[PDB]
Design a protein around this nucleic acid. Structure first.
Lengths: 121, 251, 68, 233, 56
RNA sequence: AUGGGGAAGCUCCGUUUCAAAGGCCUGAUGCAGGCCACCAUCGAAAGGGAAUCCGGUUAAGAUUCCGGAACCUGGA
RNA sequence: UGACAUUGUGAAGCUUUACUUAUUCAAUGAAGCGGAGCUGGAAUUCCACGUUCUAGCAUUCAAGGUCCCAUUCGGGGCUGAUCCGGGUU
């Protein structure tokens, strides 16, 4: 019996077996419910004069959005709450500290129609 | 009293060297098996200027004995080394300008440069421009060689210490007088912030031992003792003698 | 038991065997870390005297500090 | 054959890249491995005093085999066998109404340092075996001298792992036989007069002998070369 | 610019030759000449050494 | 920072060194198995840097919106 | 600067010299250290033991050789690259 041949003078830590956790108890009792579901991301519309102009002419809805939401969340939330495909989303942060999202729908849906469907003319 | 300028220069801060533009540390090859038994051949790719250094650096590509890689070593150019030259470094290398040889493998009177102080490091003696070391003699009994250093000092070092053949090149650099203060300004702009120097005798008495007084005079003997503590070592330190030499004083 | 023998022999720090053992163990302790887990006490008898019991949950650490 | 050529590579100093040789000698071993090896080296370089150097003497590969063969029959009861013995005794105490002599008198190797030392001191130990590689050697340095002064045969046996597999443990510094049966009395008698022959008889001469001082190979070769070319000077 | 080389075809980034987009044609010629000439010099030196070895 | 080493201690030196220091390609967490030995990280809204322009539009927006016309990156 | 401690082991006559394990210094990704052996030369001794006109090239556990199983289309061992001591120097 001869010792193992070593082609490198640098000794390295051998790659042993790494186990996966099997805890005796769950980390938390209950999984948290969806923290940012549709009714939390889409808060309320804005019906200022400029927003009204945008809905009437530009086919753009204007929504107040929680600051924790992004463009994908806003797109999916609009698609879920109001069954209309969105063409694009443009989000900004108002100086009073809340997200404002210009959601432009596809050409085959009317912003002026679904706005008064939601309730604000 | 206040911490004097020379005292302040050991803590670093603004007194560190300005090493942005330096090409790298000028060092020989590691004392590998190949170089310490026979010799290895490198090729001088390019000779470059090193900021803050008078002697041009030479970059020599060496094949790696134990791997494909090309170990590029930043030598110090010797007057005669040129691009495209083959540099033979090791014990079995022939004695031509630019070759690195252990000092036990060179005949007497040989001019070497960038001499290893002890076998194993990467060059210590005679690396400033125009400087060299003379192989005074050998001693195979204790494997040593005696050499003459640029400072006129005689030293004995293990015969396996290496050293490049020739002179460091860039010689006579101090012949030309810097006319303008700007020349010195740009010289020390890449060197450690040691310029301009204010005379201690012009300093206030708090800032320097020489300062103060109604006339700009030192006041006490300027030959400071070797054992004087830090902060008193301002002037001529451990001066055996002073004044102009007025004699041959050897060559 | 052997503990009387151990506690009497350890009192001979200048004996040849203990001198050799000390000269070896001090070198080991210098080589190892400043603070490191010692698997078992060097002097089990002294450990027992001070309160050690070779059971689970009793830990022995070895430490070196700068003298002077 | 017509297509495949022989091209012996030149592996000289400046020729082609050196092949992957065996660098096992130059491995930068971990700190613990280095401490292991250098501790053994230092312990064999320094002059080991006689009371430790006497542990360099162990049984040969025959006396050790014979002794362990003898002690194997006297391995103590395992946990399962003791439990079975307890079932037998539980039956006997209810039925036969007896505790002593309900089971045959046990005959097993006594072990444990604090037990064997007391047995040796009381001179009830017929034979004792000492592990040669205990980490605090102070635990058993005095054991051979105690054995010699108490007139009991001791053997500095090889390995505490063998003693552990004897006494159903992982390790055991010392294993002692104190009451052997008439069948194995002859075997133990032959074991002694040999064990004490190489250990107890030579005790007074190993007590005067130091050890260690075994230089490394690269220094022993140098010392040999210096002794030569100077012996003839 | 360095990143734009990723967006163009291989034709715009190489020349149809050994060391296409790395070394000049004259440098390629010089190194081919060097390779052949000093490999032949290696063979010649080996022949000379082999014939001198017998001069014992 | 870590490995380390100081310091009674708040913390200090140190930035790749007295360390058993990992992520990449796969065909499927071993892996067929291989690969590599580099060394945490922070550090510029004037340095390096993937790619957008025109016209129009508001009370206040804009190379961001609208109309038109392009390009980059990632991936199917 | 001196003494005490780390700090140990020897010789020769307060002195000299010696040893590596303590300790100290330096480098490398700890790559070739020490001893021995070949092979030629000089001559039991010593020496070398693959590379010098040239800004090329040198990588796939190496080709060859040899021995096995499977040969598959492949895999494996030795040699090539001397042996021993695991003291990295």
């Amino acid at each position: 019996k001869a010792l193992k041949v070593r082609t490198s003078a640098t000794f390295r830590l051998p790659k042993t077996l790494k186990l996966a956790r099997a805890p005796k108890y769950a980390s938390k009792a209950v999984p948290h419910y969806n923290r940012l579901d549709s009714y939390k991301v889409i808060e309320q519309p804005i019906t200022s004069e400029t927003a009204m102009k945008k809905v009437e002419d530009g086919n753009i809805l204007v929504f107040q959005v929680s600051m924790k939401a992004n463009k994908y969340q806003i797109k999916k939330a609009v698609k879920e709450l109001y069954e209309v495909d969105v063409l694009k989303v443009n989000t900004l942060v108002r100086p009073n500290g809340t997200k404002k999202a210009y959601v432009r729908l596809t050409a085959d849906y009317d912003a002026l129609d679904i706005a008064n469907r939601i309730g604000y003319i | 009293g206040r911490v004097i300028r020379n005292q302040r220069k050991g803590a670093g801060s603004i007194f560190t060297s300005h090493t942005r533009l330096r090409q790298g540390a000028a060092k020989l090859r590691t004392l590998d098996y190949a170089e310490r038994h026979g010799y290895i051949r490198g090729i001088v790719k390019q000779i470059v200027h090193d900021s803050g250094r008078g002697a041009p650096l030479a970059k020599v590509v060496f094949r790696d004995p134990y791997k494909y890689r090309l170990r590029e070593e930043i030598f110090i150019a010797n007057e005669g080394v040129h691009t495209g030259q083959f540099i033979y470094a090791g014990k079995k290398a022939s004695l031509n300008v630019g070759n690195v040889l252990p000092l036990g493998s060179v005949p007497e009177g040989t001019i070497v440069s960038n001499v290893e102080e002890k076998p194993g490091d990467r060059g210590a003696l005679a690396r400033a421009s125009g400087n060299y070391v003379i192989i005074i003699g050998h001693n195979p009994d204790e494997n040593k060689t005696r050499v003459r250093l640029p400072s006129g000092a005689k030293k004995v070092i293990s015969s396996d210490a290496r050293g490049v053949i020739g002179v460091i090149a860039g010689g006579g650099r101090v012949d030309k007088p810097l006319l303008k203060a700007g020349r010195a300004f740009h010289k020390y702009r890449l060197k450690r912030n040691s310029w301009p120097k204010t005379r201690g005798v012009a300093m206030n008495p708090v800032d320097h031992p020489h300062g103060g007084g109604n006339h700009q005079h030192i006041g006490k003997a300027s030959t400071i003792s070797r054992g004087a503590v830090s902060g008193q070592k301002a002037g001529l330190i451990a001066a055996r003698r002073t004044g102009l030499l007025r004699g041959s004083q050897k060559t | 038991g052997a503990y009387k023998y151990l506690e009497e022999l350890q009192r001979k720090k200048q004996s040849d065997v203990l001198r050799f053992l000390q000269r070896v163990r001090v070198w080991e302790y210098r080589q190892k870390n400043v603070i490191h887990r010692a698997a078992r006490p060097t002097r089990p008898d002294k450990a027992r005297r001070l309160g050690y019991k070779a059971k689970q949950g009793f830990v022995i650490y070895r430490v070196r500090v700068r003298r002077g | 054959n017509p297509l495949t050529h022989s091209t012996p590579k030149n592996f000289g100093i400046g020729q082609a890249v050196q092949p992957k040789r065996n660098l096992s000698r130059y491995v930068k071993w971990p700190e613990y491995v280095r401490v292991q090896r250098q501790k053994k080296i230092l312990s064999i370089r320094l002059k080991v005093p006689p009371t430790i150097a006497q542990f360099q003497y162990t049984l040969d590969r025959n006396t050790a085999a014979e002794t362990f063969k003898l002690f194997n029959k006297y391995r103590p009861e395992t946990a399962a066998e003791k439990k079975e013995r307890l079932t037998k005794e539980a039956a006997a105490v209810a039925e036969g109404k007896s505790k002593q002599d309900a089971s045959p008198k046990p005959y097993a190797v006594k072990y444990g340092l604090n037990h064997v030392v007391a047995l040796i001191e009381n001179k009830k130990a017929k034979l004792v075996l000492i592990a040669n590689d205990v980490d605090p050697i102070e635990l058993v340095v005095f054991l051979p001298a105690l054995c010699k002064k108490m007139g009991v045969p001791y053997a500095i046996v090889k390995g505490k792992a063998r003693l552990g597999t004897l006494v159903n443990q992982k390790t055991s510094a010392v294993a002692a036989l104190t009451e052997v049966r008439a069948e194995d009395e002859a075997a133990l008698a032959k074991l002694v007069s040999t064990i004490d022959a190489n250990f107890a008889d030579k005790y007074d001469e190993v007590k005067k002998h130091w050890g260690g001082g075994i230089l490394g190979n690269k220094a022993q070769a140098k010392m040999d070369k210096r002794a030569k070319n100077s012996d003839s000077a | 610019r360095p990143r734009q080389y990723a967006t163009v075809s291989k034709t715009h980034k190489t020349v149809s030759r050994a060391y296409g987009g790395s070394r000049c044609a004259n440098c390629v010629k010089e190194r081919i000449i060097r390779a052949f000439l000093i490999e032949e010099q290696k063979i010649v030196k080996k022949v000379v050494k082999e014939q001198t070895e017998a001069a014992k």
